[PDB]
Structure 1
Amino acid sequence: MNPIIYTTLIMTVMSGTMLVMISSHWLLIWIGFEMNLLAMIPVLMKNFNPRATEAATKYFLTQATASMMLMMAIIINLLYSGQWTITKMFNPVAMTMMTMALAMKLGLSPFHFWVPEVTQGISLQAGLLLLTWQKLAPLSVLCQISQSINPNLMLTMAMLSILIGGWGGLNQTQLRKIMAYSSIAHMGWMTAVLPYNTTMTILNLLIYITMTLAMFMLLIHSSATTTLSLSHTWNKMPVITSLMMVTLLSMGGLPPLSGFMPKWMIIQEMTKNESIIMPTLMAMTALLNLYFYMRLAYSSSLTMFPSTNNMKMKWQFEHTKQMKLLPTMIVLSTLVLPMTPALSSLN
């Protein structure tokens, strides 16, 4: 792809997201979603191969079905009230259809099936974009209509997302599928607290985005997409594996690391609403994500795997391209728990 065309497509994806997040009219939100998808499809196929084509086709089918459902919900809401403003859905059937469409766009269970496959089929940069930037628009729409959502359906989908993310991640040797299942579990955590407090949803989104950016940048730096490929990194860049191990511990939510702060803030919030069973189950299930993060850390940094002879040649060369925001991303992914009260600036 031409670099100018690539920049235009990236800016069109971003413009679709901004259109979604600045619009007060349902039609403009729908248009933002369409523009985002249209510009997003070629970015997934930037490195042409059969796997990228299959991933793009699956992604487009999922998102186009979700867009059809979303427009149907908009039209039903308009039918039962001549309203185009995104405030609060006036028809419960329209609200259910809108919630399902947004869950399908986000990849929440049971509409999670496409998230691993697509993430496996594209490059690491495309996966970074797909797992960080593509969540902003549906989550913003969900935040705007939070009072209208039926708590039972949303909480069922959130609990299913956490459970399925943990269980699916337990079985993976490929790093992109691991990141996808991690993403599904984190999305469940985000959508669980949405009916109670949208500021907690935003805080969780920011923290997850920071840690996901750190991990994808570390995986691009050590160009590894499998566990065994990542097991060679200690013999070329030990600092990278150490930083990856600390970031993995943070993603598992262990204190005093940053990844603990969202869950801690969510469970607590839920207890203000007389919700104890769901937070208890949520934490006990996030233990599974911690388990497969720990397994990756075992294979990558805490032990030393056998290497190859040709690695000696790689000892003689440095990394040509430097990532400016990787150090800030790692520090933000690990050492921000003492600044927890700053979350008040998010409301």
Structure 2
Amino acid sequence: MNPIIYTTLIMTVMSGTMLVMISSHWLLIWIGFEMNLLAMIPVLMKNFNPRATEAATKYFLTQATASMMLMMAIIINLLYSGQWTITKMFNPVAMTMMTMALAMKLGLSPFHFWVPEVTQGISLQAGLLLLTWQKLAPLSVLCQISQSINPNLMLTMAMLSILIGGWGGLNQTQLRKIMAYSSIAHMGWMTAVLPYNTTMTILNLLIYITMTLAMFMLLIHSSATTTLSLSHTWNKMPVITSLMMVTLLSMGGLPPLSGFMPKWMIIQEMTKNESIIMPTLMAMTALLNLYFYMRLAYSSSLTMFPSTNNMKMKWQFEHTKQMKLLPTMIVLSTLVLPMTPALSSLN
């Protein structure tokens, strides 16, 4: 792919998301979604191989079905209200269809399989962009339409997402599938807190994006896509393994790291509204995520797996490409707990 074409497609994806986030018209929001998907498909199919083609095909099918459902919901809402402005939807059936379409776009359970499938199919940069941006946009739409969301359905989908992410991450071995299930669990947390405080939703989004960027960029730096491939990193650059370990600890919600702040704020907000059982179950279920994070950290940082012989040549040579904002994302993902009251600024 030509660099000019690649940057044009990236800017088209970003422009589609910006159009979705700045448009007050349902037709314009749908147009932004269509543009985002259209420009996103080649980014997935950059490195051409049958696995990438299959991942792109599955992603296209899922996103097209979600877009059709979203347009149907828009039309149904227009039928009973005659309004195009994105506000509290005036029809429960249209609201349910919109919620299901946005859940399918985000990856919430039971619409989650395509997330690990595509993430394994595509490369690390494609997975990073996919997760981050393609979860950034529908969450903005949901935050705009929050006041009409059915709490029962939203919380059911959120809890299912958390459980499914935990169990999938427990069983998986591939780094990209682990990241996909982590994304599913964090989206579950965000959508669980969504019907109560969109500010907490945005805070969780920002923290999750920072941690995911840090983890994916560390994986790109180490050029590891499996557990055993990552197990050789300690013999070439042990600093990266330690940074990855602290990032994994933060993603598990362990205090006093940055990952504990979203869970803490969400628990507080949900327990303000006389909801105890849901926060308790959500907090207890994150232990599965922390378990597979710790299992991944054992193989890379806290132990020394056997190495190979060409690693000496690896030592002789030096990394050339420099990651952008990697130290900043590492610091922001582990040491911003004492700056929690900035959520008022985020408000």
> Does TM-score exceed 0.5, indicating one fold?
yes
Partner of residue 341, structure 1: 341
- In structure 2, what is the Cα distance between the partners aligned to 1:193 and 1:234? 38
Mapped to 1, the partners of 2:85 and 2:137 lie a distance apart of 16
In structure 2, the partner of 1:249 is 249
Q: Give a deviation string over 1:54-82, Cα, whole Å, max 9, x none.
A: 00000000000000000000000000011
Please give the per-residue CA displacement for 1:7-31, whole angstroms capped at 9, x wherever unaligned.
0000000000000000000000000
Q: Distance in 2 between matches of 1:41 and 1:26?
A: 23
Please state whether the residue corresponding to 1:307 is helix, strand or coil: coil
CA-to-partner distance for each residue in 1:183-211, whole Å, 9 max, x for gaps?
00000000001110000000000000000
Query: How far did residue 236 of structure 1 move?
Result: 0.2
The CA deviation string for residues 230-287 of structure 1, in whole angstroms up to 9 with x for no partner, is 0000000100000000000000000000000000000000010000000000010001
Query: CA–CA distance in 2 between the matches of 1:16 and 1:319?
Result: 35
Structure 2 equivalent of residue 156 of structure 1: 156
Q: How does 1:1-347 map to 2 (within 5 A)?
A: 1-347=1-347
How far apart, CA to CA, are the structure 1 residues paired with 2:113 and 2:197? 28
- CA–CA distance in 1 between the matches of 2:134 and 2:98? 17
**What displacement does 1:338 show?**
0.1
SS of structure 2 residue aligned to 1:315: helix
Distance 2:230 2:143 in 1: 38
The TM-score, its normalising length taken from structure 1, stands at 1.00
TM-score normalised to structure 2 length: 1.00
User: What CA deviation, in whole Å up to 9, does each residue of 1:149-203 have, x standing for no partner?
Assistant: 0000000000000000000000111000000000000000000011100000000
Using the TM superposition, give the Cα deviation of residue 118 of structure 1 relative to its aligned residue in structure 2, in angstroms.
0.1
Give structure 1 stretches of 5+ with no counterpart.
Answer: none
Aligned residue for 1:256, secondary structure, equals coil
Looking at structure 1, the residues matched to 148 and 127 of structure 2 have their Cα atoms a distance apart, in angstroms, of 32
CA deviation after TM superposition for structure 1 residue 134, in Å: 1.1
Report the alpha carbon displacement of residue 324 of structure 1 after superposing the two structures with TM.
2.6
Report the Cα distance in structure 1 between the residues aligned to 2:36 and 2:133, rounded to whole angstroms: 10
Tell me how far apart the structure 2 counterparts of residues 324 and 278 of structure 1 sit (CA, whole Å). Answer: 39
Q: Secondary structure at the match of 2:97?
A: helix
Q: Distance between the aligned counterparts of 1:173 and 1:271, measured in 2?
A: 35
Cα deviation 1:287-308 (Å, max 9, x = unaligned): 1000000000000000000000
- Deviation of the 1:136 alpha carbon: 1.1
> What is the CA–CA distance in structure 2 between the aligned matches of 1:135 and 1:324, rounded to whole Å?
22
Q: Return the alpha-carbon distance in structure 2 between the equivalents of residues 215 and 326 of structure 1.
A: 9
- CA deviations 1:85-118 (Å, max 9, x no partner) are 0011000000000000000000000000100010
> How many residues end up aligned between the 2 structures?
347
Find runs of 4+ consecutive structure 1 residues off by over 4 angstroms. Answer: none
2: distance between equivalents of 1:318 and 1:95? 55
Residue 314 (structure 1) shift: 0.4
Deviation at residue 318 of structure 1 after TM alignment: 1.2
1:335 Cα offset (Å): 0.1
Secondary structure of the corresponding residue to residue 224 of structure 1: coil
Matched residues in 1 for 2:150 and 2:174: separation?
A: 36
**What is the SS of the residue equivalent to 2:275?**
coil
Counterpart secondary structure, 1:334: coil
- Once residues 168 and 41 of structure 1 are traced to their aligned partners in structure 2, the CA distance between those partners, rounded to angstroms, is 26
Q: Provide the rounded CA distance (Å) in 2 between the counterparts of 1:134 and 1:102.
A: 11
How much identity, in percent, do the aligned residues show?
100
Distance 1:318 1:23 in 2: 47
Alpha-carbon distance, 1:137 to partner? 1.0
CA distance in 2, matches of 1:85, 1:93: 18
Distance in 1 between the 2:136 and 2:311 partners?
Answer: 40
For 1:137 and 1:86, locate their aligned partners in 2 and report how far apart those are by CA, in whole Å.
15
Q: CA deviation at 1:37?
A: 0.1
Unpaired runs of 5+ residues, structure 2, are none
**What is the CA-CA distance between 1:315 and the residue it aligns to?**
0.3
Question: Which deviations, in whole Å up to 9, do the C-alpha atoms of 1:119-159 show, x marking residues without a partner?
Answer: 00000000000111111110000000100000000000000
Q: What is the alpha-carbon root mean square deviation over aligned residues?
A: 0.4
